[PDB]
C-alpha cells in the first residue's frame, strides 16, 4: 500500500462510496491503482468505445462517417440535447459520435450502438483491440441503472485506462482515427467539474464523463501535463443507494491525490 493509495481510501470512507482509480504515467508505463479490479458501472464512459468502434469501421469505409442516420421522434430518450434538434431529419454518423462524446447524447450513443449491430458488437469491438474486461449488455438509458453487484454494463478501472491508452495514444486505431477521437475528447464540454477539476489548469485534458443511478459518477481522461509524457488516468465512484446525489467533487479530490503524488 502505497501513500496515495492510503489518501484514497480516506478519500472513499469519508465520501461513503466505493472509488475506483487507474493511473497509467506514460513516461514510464508505470501504475496506480485503487480497486483496480474491482468492477464499476461505466454509464456514459462507455460512449468512448462505441464512438472508437464506429472510427475502427471507417478505416476500410473513407465515406461511413458522413453517412445519414435517420432520427425519428419515438428514437429520444432521457438525455438528447443534440439529437432533439434532427427529429425527422439525420445526423452523419461524424455527428452522433461527436454529440455522444461531448455532449453525452443518449440518443447518439444508441445510433452508434445499432451502427455496430447492438451492445454485442461494441463489446466484440473491445475483445478485438485486447480489453477481455468491457461489456456493454444494453442501450440507453437502461445501460445506466448500476445496481450494485450487477455485472451489465461494468468494466475494471484497471481494463478501462489500458483500453483508453490504446485508443488515444496506442495504436488500437489508425492514425487520423486516433487523432479524430483525441480531437472530440479534447471538446468535451461536461468535465470541467471532474477529473480537471483536481489538475494543474495549465495542464491539457480530454475526457468523457459518466452518470447514472446509485449516484454513479465516473471520469475517463487523457491528460498532457505541463513538461512531461501523458498520463490516462480513470476514477469511478459508485453509492449505496439508488438515488444518491451526484459527486464529481469526488473525482476532483481523486485526480488531486494522484497529481500529488506524480
Ligand atoms: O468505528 C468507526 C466509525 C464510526 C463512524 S465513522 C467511523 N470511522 C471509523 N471507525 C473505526 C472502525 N473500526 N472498524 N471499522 N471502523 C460513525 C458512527 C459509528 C462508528
Ligand atoms: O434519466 C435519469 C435522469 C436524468 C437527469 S437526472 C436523472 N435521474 C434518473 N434518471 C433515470 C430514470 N429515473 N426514472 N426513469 N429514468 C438529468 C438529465 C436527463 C436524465
Ligand atoms: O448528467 C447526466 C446525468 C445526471 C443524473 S443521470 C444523468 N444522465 C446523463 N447525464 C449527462 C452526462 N454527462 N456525462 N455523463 N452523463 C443524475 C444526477 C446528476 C446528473
Not at 187 to 211: E, F
Request: charged share 20%; net charge neutral; with cysteine.
Amino acid at each position: 500500500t502505497s501513500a496515495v493509495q492510503q489518501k484514497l481510501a480516506a478519500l472513499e470512507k469519508s465520501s461513503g462510496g466505493r472509488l475506483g482509480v487507474a493511473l497509467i504515467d506514460t513516461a514510464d508505463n508505470t501504475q496506480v491503482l485503487y480497486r483496480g479490479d474491482e468492477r464499476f458501472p461505466m454509464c456514459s464512459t462507455s460512449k468512448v468505445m462505441a464512438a472508437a468502434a464506429v472510427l475502427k469501421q471507417s478505416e476500410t469505409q473513407k465515406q461511413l462517417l458522413n453517412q445519414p442516420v435517420e432520427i425519428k421522434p419515438a428514437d429520444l430518450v432521457n438525455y438528447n440535447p443534440i439529437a432533439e434538434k434532427h427529429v425527422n431529419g439525420t445526423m452523419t454518423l461524424a455527428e452522433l459520435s461527436a454529440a455522444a462524446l461531448q455532449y453525452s447524447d443518449n440518443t447518439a450513443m444508441n445510433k452508434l450502438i445499432a451502427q455496430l449491430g447492438g451492445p454485442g458488437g461494441v463489446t466484440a469491438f473491445a475483445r478485438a483491440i485486447g480489453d477481455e474486461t468491457f461489456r456493454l449488455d444494453r442501450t440507453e438509458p437502461t445501460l445506466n441503472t448500476a445496481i450494485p453487484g450487477d455485472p451489465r454494463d461494468t468494466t475494471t478501472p484497471r481494463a478501462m485506462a489500458q483500453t483508453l491508452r490504446q485508443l488515444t495514444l496506442g495504436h488500437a486505431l489508425g492514425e487520423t482515427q486516433r487523432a479524430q477521437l483525441v480531437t472530440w475528447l479534447k471538446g468535451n464540454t461536461t468535465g470541467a467539474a471532474s477529473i480537471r477539476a483536481g489538475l494543474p489548469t495549465s495542464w491539457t485534458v480530454g475526457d468523457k464523463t459518466g452518470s447514472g443511478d446509485y449516484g454513479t459518477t465516473n471520469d475517463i481522461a487523457v491528460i498532457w501535463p505541463q513538461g512531461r509524457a501523458p498520463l490516462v488516468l480513470v476514477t469511478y465512484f459508485t453509492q449505496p443507494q439508488q438515488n444518491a446525489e451526484s459527486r464529481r467533487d469526488v473525482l476532483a479530490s481523486a485526480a488531486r491525490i494522484i497529481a500529488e503524488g506524480l
